[PDB]
Amino acid sequence: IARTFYDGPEKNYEKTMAILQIEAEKAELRLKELEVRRLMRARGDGPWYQYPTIDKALIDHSPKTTPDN
């Protein structure tokens, strides 16, 4: 029965080790992402949460019919 239907314990053991590593990495990545989102939303210095401002390319820098703009 053991020869025909199953494997040794080392296979399940090391598959479990691989599964555990994947899951623990995913967990720490999730926590880190939550912290990064908190900081990027509070500070606005990150690539995320960039709210539009006015394009400076719309300003007209030509003499404006009076000297003081």
Ligand X SMILES: CCCCCCCCCCCCCCCCC[C@@H](O)O[C@H](CO[C@H](O)CCCCCCCCCCCCCCC)COP(=O)(O)OCC[N+](C)(C)C
SS3 state of residue 16: helix
- The H or E element spanning position 10 is helix 9-43
5 binds ligand X (CB under 6 A): yes
Q: Which does 7 bind (CB under 5 to 8 A by kind): ligand X, another protein, none?
A: ligand X
Is residue 47 within 8 Å of 53, Cβ to Cβ? no
Q: Closest separation between CB of residue 60 and another protein, Å?
A: 15
Q: Closest separation between CB of residue 69 and another protein, Å?
A: 7
Q: Residues interacting with ligand X, by CB under 6 A?
A: 4-7
